[PDB]
């Protein structure tokens with residue numbers, strides 16, 4: 001996956017009008033948008049088609065899929081049928097649940113991202129201790145795309161070590177959660193940014209500024 | 219909540235006409251329906267209102283919420299706005315993520331169910347080792363409703379022990395995944411059943427049959 005400016009917009013606005021407006025405002029800077037449940041549950045799966053029609057951006061469905069295999073398969077099918085290019089899947093529920101997503105993605109020609117360690121403080125309770133193993137599991141399963149936390153660069157570094165330089169790694173937590181874009185891009189291929197852009201008075205300027213701060217990494 | 223016949227239908231059909239037909243056919247036996255992402259992502263969040271309009275059923279939104287606290291809040295808000303009585307939340311992302319859901323539920327007068335251990339084989343990799351602590355964390359947070367696996371009675375028993383007799387416990391995995399309704403109701407207040415009912419030639423007969431088998435526990 002070739003992410004423009006190593007920057008993925010986390011479009012978590014919950015109003016169709018606002019979401020389309022803000023994404024339109026930053027379209028020149030990004031070609032990849034992560035759409036999650038806040039938007040989808042508020043506006044419907046048709047929002048994915050709407051984004052594709054208006055922007056042509058790649059769409060990563062951030063559904064943190066975390067069900068049993070049978071249900072995971074149904075979720076992935078519905079998601080890819082709606083036009084998502086990729087889906088984010090939790091690794092914590094284990095290998096079979098991940099494989100179920102990999103199977104659908106393989107059949108439909110889409111991508112799975114494996115979420116290994118999360119960026120919020122609660123991640124330290126259970127996820128962090130399992131994260132290295134989750135990443136190794138992804139490697140065993142042939143997962144090529146991963147998600148890890150901007151706010152813990154030492155953990156992001158470990159994740160990168162595990163998956164190798166050829167795997168694709170994206171990382172949320174830059175900006176609002178305190179992660180630094182430049183430091184994060186030492187290890188991740190692209191950063192995910194939501195509030196620092198979409199809550200900005202001027203989202204275009206916010207996007208431009210982030211990109212300016214990392215220009216030597218582009 | 220008072221679940222009729224201790225039986226919750228997992229309506230994971232992905233076609234609105236089929237979902238409505240089957241639910242309507244079993245409505246005499248079940249007043250609580252679990253609606254997850256397979257149906258919601260196929261038919262939209264409007265499906266929740268449609269079920270409310272057609273049937274006298276409580277709706278549990280099985281969305282396995284597993285994001286950071288800020289995103290969890292948005293998901294719960296969108297879900298309760300759509301008319302869900304309750305939402306199911308993963309505990310593995312930790313206490314802050316759960317607390318975020320509890321805050322919205324308290325604010326909107328709805329219920330949170332904490333998913334502790336899952337019923338699929340992959341659950342043994344990471345979730346199982348954390349499940350006792352997740353349950354205990356639920357108790358510390360004041361969570362009153364829990365989900366645990368029908369297919370591991372020993373684990374379901376431990377869960378019930380941790381949360382106490384006053385907590386409400388529902389359990390999937392009966393039927394298609396090999397769990398036994400009767401054994402499961404030794405520990406769970408209600409069982410969740412999907413395929414054994416919705417894939418039956420006569421779903422009403424399938425539900426009636428299950429209820430008949432546990433008649434003494436009602």
Ligand SMILES: O=c1cc(O)n([C@@H]2O[C@H](COP(=O)(O)O)[C@@H](O)[C@H]2O)c(=O)[nH]1
Nearest residue numbers: 010118119172176193194195285286289
């Ligand atoms: O570990 C993770 C994984 C995520 O997907 N996310 C997601 O990435 C986005 C981060 O948004 P923000 O830049 O406003 O913090 C949100 O959509 C959130 O759900 C995260 O914050 N941490």
Ligand SMILES: O=c1cc(O)n([C@@H]2O[C@H](COP(=O)(O)O)[C@@H](O)[C@H]2O)c(=O)[nH]1
Nearest residue numbers: 068071228336337390394395411412413
């Ligand atoms: O540990 C769990 C937690 C669940 O929510 N579920 C859900 O419960 C339902 C079980 O359906 P079924 O009876 O067809 O196996 C599905 O909707 C599934 O996503 C589960 O099977 N195991």
